[PDB]
């Protein structure tokens, strides 16, 4: 009930999709079902094609200075619907309701593709965002290469996301002895968006030097890899405390932090969740991948770590995941009480 | 011998440059938002403006007897203006090349020139440096009525060092950085892990070849004139011709507009000049 349809500006070639969301499982993703509808005319001398592109828009001001389109494609698929596997339950309902001129199309995304993650349009940076943008492009063509116009096509956009696993992960911990014995831990590995993060800072100094200030920092690693690997640091929450521990003594505290977008609207390099239009979403969900490192895994990979530092500077880093739970009904993918 | 060809090249460059320079300045300064690359393009367009302002005067200067019939006219001002324009254009070309070499591996922050204040201070520094190099005109230039015609002519090691420094600024700065950045990115030389599109490849090659064929002949002719000077003579070597180098210079200054900005996004916008819903489904 309540399928999503997008109609091209001319009165023909609309596209029906069951849901504008496709969870990315570790092994196999959900196939991109849907039915492209076309009027009886306008096709007798052509055929319909559906093309899915995993774009990598990464250019500011969306201007091609020297032919730099920035339109790097990570995966492209083609299907002919008006010349396979049996149709799922949803596709049969669309065929029955729409009529006999309801040509189905089905996609099968391979594993270890990056999820839909964008970067925050901070100062300047006018135009579109910087990140992976999946899209479904339905058009009529008979050569696979003839230039098609945006008017005679549907540029429906989809988003591929990943949700937190049911089984909680192992509790993270780290230590560092070099100058001072340090021990840190988190409450639980699985963290939902907006939930507080509690850390343990139980420490036992031994050196004559005494700590002056303590800082707990959370940063969001944007491991963007298109031509070379990157390990960008962008802080997302900070906690500076004046607490001090005397030499040959111990200090334990339960300082808590909470990452949110209210105070990070000006920072650059921050990665947000997948966006379909100019609305604002939350921080980018942590992306998890299977073993073997997936070779290079070209795309944007978001990982979260929390660190504790001493100012006198031994520091430790504790990874964790920041992911949404499995939704009950459906994500509307927009500010529900908008405007 | 080739004076007719040079005049034809002058006319073609002017005709293809005035509208091309006009369209880019208005489009960038009115429609598109101010970005560092857009400011580079607009500054290059302004350099083309003032560069071609004296081009109609250059028509009369390249007219009969390849001389300056406008008398004195304080032509120090417009000669310095033209040389300042050419220096500013080549400096904007090389800074665009450097910014493009920074453009690859885009997500990095690099030297943090994305701020508008840094772009404006760099532009004004470039203008001041080009005015410093383009400053000295009355120091050497004079005018005489020789062979029953007056000319704007320049006036022994001072001329040698002046031409040497002008050539080294016009070659080491633009051309060496173009070969370091453009050439050692397109031919897999130097770190070539960055893939390049076919359109990107072709347009970089066109930029490089146009720059070469338009500016290398002029610098080479200047160096040859400096070398053959102070020895032999001038009327035997017959250097009364060769305005083709300056014609190619004007061709480059009018071709860079259409090549740089009049592509991709601009092409579709100039040619030109639904909401997603839901539907029923029975259970």
């Amino acid at each position, epitope marked *: 009930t309540r399928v999503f349809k997008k*109609a091209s500006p001319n*009165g023909k070639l609309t596209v029906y999709l069951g849901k504008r969301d496709f969870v990315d499982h570790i092994d196999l993703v959900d196939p991109v079902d849907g039915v492209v509808l076309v009027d009886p005319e306008y096709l007798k001398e052509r055929r319909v094609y559906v093309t899915l592109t995993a774009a990598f828009r990464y250019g500011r001001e969306d201007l091609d200075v020297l032919g730099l389109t920035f339109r790097k494609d990570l995966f492209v698929a083609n299907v002919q619907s008006f010349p396979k596997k049996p149709l799922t339950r949803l596709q049969e309902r669309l065929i029955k309701k*729409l009529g006999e001129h309801a040509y189905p199309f089905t996609f099968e995304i391979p594993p270890n593709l990056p999820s839909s993650v964008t970067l925050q349009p901070g100062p300047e940076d006018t135009g579109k965002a910087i990140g992976v943008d999946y899209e479904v492009k339905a058009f009529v063509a008979e050569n696979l290469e003839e230039k098609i116009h945006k008017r005679n096509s549907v540029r429906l956009v989809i988003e591929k996301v990943q949700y937190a696993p049911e089984r909680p992960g192992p509790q993270p911990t780290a230590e560092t002895t070099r100058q001072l014995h340090l021990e840190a831990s988190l409450d639980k590995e699985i963290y939902y968006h907006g939930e507080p993060i509690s850390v343990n800072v139980h420490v036992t100094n031994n050196t004559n030097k005494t700590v002056k200030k303590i800082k707990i920092s959370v940063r969001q690693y944007a491991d963007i890899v298109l031509f070379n690997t990157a390990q960008y640091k962008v802080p997302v929450a900070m906690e500076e405390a004046d607490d001090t521990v005397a030499p040959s003594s111990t200090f334990s505290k339960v300082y808590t932090l909470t990452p949110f977008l209210a105070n990070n609207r000006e920072k650059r390099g921050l990665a947000l969740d997948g966006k379909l239009k100019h609305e604002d979403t939350n921080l980018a969900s942590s992306t998890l991948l299977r073993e073997g490192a997936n070779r290079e895994i070209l795309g944007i990979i978001v990982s979260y770590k929390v660190k504790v530092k001493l100012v006198v500077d031994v520091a430790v880093e504790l990874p964790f995941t920041l992911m949404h739970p499995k939704p009950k009904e459906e994500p509307p993918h927009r500010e529900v009480p908008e405007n | 011998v080739v004076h007719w060809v040079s005049l034809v090249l002058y006319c073609l460059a002017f005709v293809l440059g005035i509208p091309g320079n006009a369209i880019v300045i208005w489009f960038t300064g009115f429609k598109w938002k101010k970005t560092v690359t857009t400011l580079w393009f607009l500054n290059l367009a302004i350099a083309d403006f003032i560069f071609l302002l004296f081009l109609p005067l250059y028509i009369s200067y390249v007219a009969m007897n390849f001389h300056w019939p406008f008398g004195i006219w304080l032509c120090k001002a417009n000669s310095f203006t033209a040389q300042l324009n050419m220096f500013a254009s080549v400096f904007f070309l090389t800074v665009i090349s450097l910014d493009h070499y920074i453009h690859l591996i885009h997500p990095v922050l690099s030297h943090r020139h994305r701020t508008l204040k840094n772009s404006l201070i760099v532009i004004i520094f470039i203008w001041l440096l080009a005015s410093l190099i383009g400053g000295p005109a009355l120091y050497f230039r004079d005018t005489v009525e020789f062979n029953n015609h007056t000319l704007c002519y320049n006036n022994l090691i001072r001329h040698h060092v002046l031409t040497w420094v002008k050539f080294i600024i016009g070659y080491l700065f633009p051309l060496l950085t173009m070969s370091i950045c453009y050439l050692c990115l397109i031919f897999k030389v130097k770190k070539r892990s960055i893939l390049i599109s076919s359109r990107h490849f072709w347009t970089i090659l066109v930029v490089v070849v146009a720059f070469v064929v338009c500016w290398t002949p002029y610098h080479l002719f200047s160096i040859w004139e400096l070398t053959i000077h102070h020895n032999s003579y001038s009327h035997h070597v017959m250097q009364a011709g060769i305005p083709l180098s300056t014609g190619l210079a004007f061709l480059n200054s009018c071709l860079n507009p259409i090549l740089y900005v009049l592509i991709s996004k601009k092409f579709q916008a100039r040619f030109r000049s639904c909401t997603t*819903a839901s539907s029923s489904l029975a259970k």
Partner: nanobody
Amino acid sequence: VQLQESGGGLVQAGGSLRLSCVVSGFFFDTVTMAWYRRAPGKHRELVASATAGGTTTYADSVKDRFTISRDNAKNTVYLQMNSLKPEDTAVYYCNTFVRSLSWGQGTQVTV
């Protein structure tokens, strides 16, 4: 997006209503503008196709019972009916065959 539907009323049996659909906006040109009907409590279903040329495809319960005409000059489409069964009670909507326009409030036809 105007979607002006008119020509509704109460008829005992076998009476034409002559519905009309007028749309303001993009011209029809070369698109197939269709007609849909929705019984109370049911879903929409196709009635007639009315392509740019003259080819009309009806439904199982509509064939040899209904007629359709299009007027391109006024950007409007009409339906003409005869021998209306009591089952015909439904809300008639007008929309492109591809279902690209917004579903405006249609007219009520009761038999």
